[PDB]
Structure formats: C-alpha cells, structure tokens
Design a protein around this ligand. Structure first.
Ligand SMILES: Cn1cc(C(N)=O)c([C@@H]2CCCNC2)n1
Ligand SMILES: [Cl-]
Ligand SMILES: [Mg+2]
Ligand SMILES: [Mg+2]
Ligand SMILES: [Mg+2]
Ligand SMILES: [Mg+2]
Lengths: 194, 194
C-alpha cells in the first residue's frame, strides 16, 4: 500500500545527510518524513556489520566479546558489539572478521550472517548485517589478542560470560558513566528470558 | 580521556538535526564527527521499545511485533512496539501506552532497562527496553483494540518465542521486509542461549 514518492536533500555532510521524504499513506494521502542517511553506501547490502563474537575456550564458560569506545554523538563511552562499515567490494563476512580483528585482536570463524537489519528505521535508512562469529580461544593466534586500531580508533575490549551477561552489563553501568548498546542489551535480555 | 569540546549546528529540521561535533581524542588531538540528534528530548531517553511476551495457556508463548512502512527505509519493517516518551511520562507508562496504541494489548511491566543507545556512531538516540507480559487469557485482551495516532498504520504480527529467528527469516525471505536490529538480536540470543 505505502511507497516513496520523492526524496529531497535538505543538508549533505561528508558522512551523513538529512532528506525530506514524501510518501503515500494507506488512506491515499501524501505525507512527509525527515530522514537520515549515510553518504557512504554504494553497492553494499548494508551500511555496516556488527559482530556477535562468541569466545570459546576449553573449561571456560563461553564469553561475548564487546568493545568500549568514546562515541562523539553520545558524548561519552558506549559498550557495543564490535562493528564497522563495510568497505566497497567487501562482503559482510569479510567486514565482520576484519573489524573483529582490528577492534579486539581476535581471529574469528564465521558462524552465521543475518540479512540486512535496520538500525533505527524511524530515523534513518541505516542497516547492518549481524554476523555471529566463534573465536577459538585455545588457538595460539588468539592467545595474545592485540587490537589493531586505525587512525582515530581507540578501543577497549570487554569479554563477559554469556551465562551472566545482563547482570554483568548492569554491574558495569552501575560502576561508571557509560551506555550499553540496545542490540547488546536485547541480546542479553533474550539470554535471560531463555 | 575523551570528551566533547563543542558542537556546530549544521542543519535543524522540525524532528531531526545534523551537528558537527569537535572532540578530544585520547592522544590529545582534536577531531571532528558528524552526528545526528532528535529535537524532541526533554527525559530519561528518547523512546521506549516494548518486548511484549504474549502468554496464553495451552499455546506457545509469542512475542508481539509490529509491521509498519518506514519512510527512511522506503519499505516495511518488523519491530518491537515502540514510540517516543511524552514529556511527563515515565518509561514504564510510555511502554504500556505504546503497546496498547500499537497492538491493543494491555500489559504488565516485567522489567525496564536503563537508557541504551540506538546507533552511537551516528546519533545520540536512546531508548528504554521494557519487557512486558500480556495475559492473553484475560477478557481485556480477548479482542485487542489497536488505537493509532494520526498517520500511524500498524499491523500486528505475533510470533512464537521458541522459533522466533526461523520465523523472522521466513518473513524476510517471503515478503521483502526488514527486521529491526534489536528484534533480530533478541531472536539470535534466544537460539544461542545455553
Ligand atoms: C559520522 N561519521 C562517520 C565517519 C567515518 N567516515 O568514519 C566520520 C568522520 C571520518 C573522518 C574523521 N572524523 C570522523 N563521521
Ligand atoms: Cl518474560
Ligand atoms: Mg567500529
Ligand atoms: Mg573499526
Ligand atoms: Mg511506533
Ligand atoms: Mg505509538
């Protein structure tokens, strides 16, 4: 029933733009929407990837590997799945493994890869693939993981047991000013609800 | 170590603005970031998203989701019931109201997250994730009456909690819908638990 009629630029930055979207509603009335988009998406199936990295080690409980970074939009530190934008020509899987190694030092193995999912669909067109990766923490390549950050990347690694994820995130929120990412919190809630 | 130095307004709409954020990197070099904010926050957070657990005896437990056309996406999305928090509203209250308006269900609060970030590399947007159970055997929920605001056009899709990720994938495959990142994350963790 509903479809896009027109998209008009309001403001284009180097990385992010604001558009006036005109669309058809299901009464048959025309309406507008203020919409955010990145300037960086080309042929990618999505803007980015986020990695759910399952650290596995004999006689350890499974951990979820997260990252803590300053996020200028938020004006503070956030705890998130490792994530980055997909380079032009790069597959989602390659992007996930690369970003995981850059941000955490770990060399993972692909488990599964989602379809493109929407980040905040009332605000933006931004999409990611959520890629689940296992990390064999018994491999000597994953013994001494060193983050390889790029220019302007400054990432701390935080590994938390899957079997207590939500409480451990709450204990970090209670101990410093920081925000947990919604996808991470969602994942931690479902682990409790199951 | 890192902190905001200043913001430069690029472009303000009615609903959304684009800023250029100047910040101190951890090495003492001054850096810039293009950031999006909503104009509507007072509030604990921008919005709520409701995880509604529909509980009917002798039936599978279901998660209640909404399908809506999203003008920034140019298509239909599958999401948790959700909306912005009114000035004066507590998140719990917003959650119960948004749930009722969007699905017709009347729910009881189970738990409420702290403010969590939606897309922290892009925006400052935050929500409370509010877990709510719906006693589906209760007379008030026998004929759930979804009460839209002006311009809202919401289908209700209840999916069994035990097969959630497979059922979401089936919808994407069959229907050209985008599933929400927090919905997908939650569905993933349901399968990953234990
Ligand atoms: C919103 N945003 C995304 C990017 C990016 N392309 O990684 C940026 C810039 C990149 C150049 C240095 N400062 C940050 N801003
Ligand atoms: Cl529950
Ligand atoms: Mg990143
Ligand atoms: Mg990166
Ligand atoms: Mg809504
Ligand atoms: Mg609503």
């Amino acid at each position: 029933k509903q479809y896009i009629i027109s998209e008009e630029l309001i403001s284009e930055g180097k990385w992010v733009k604001l558009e006036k979207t005109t669309y058809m509603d299901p009464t048959g009335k025309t309406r507008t929407w203020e919409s955010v988009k990145r300037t960086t998406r080309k042929e990618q199936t999505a803007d980015g990837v986020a990695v759910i990295p399952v650290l596995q080690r004999t006689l350890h409980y499974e951990c979820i590997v997260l990252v803590k970074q300053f996020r200028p939009p938020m004006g503070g530190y956030c705890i998130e799945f490792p994530a980055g934008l997909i380079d032009d020509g790069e597959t989602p899987e390659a992007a996930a493994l690369r970003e995981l190694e850059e941000e955490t030092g770990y060399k993972g193995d692909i488990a599964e890869c989602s379809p493109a999912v929407c980040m905040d669909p009332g605000l933006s067109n931004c999409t990611i693939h959520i890629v689940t990766v296992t990390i064999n923490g018994d491999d000597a390549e994953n013994a001494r993981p060193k983050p390889k950050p790029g220019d302007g990347e400054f990432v701390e690694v935080i590994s938390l047991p899957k079997n207590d994820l939500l409480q451990r995130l709450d204990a970090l929120v209670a101990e410093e000013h920081l925000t947990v990412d919604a996808r991470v919190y969602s994942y931690a809630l479902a682990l409790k609800h199951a």
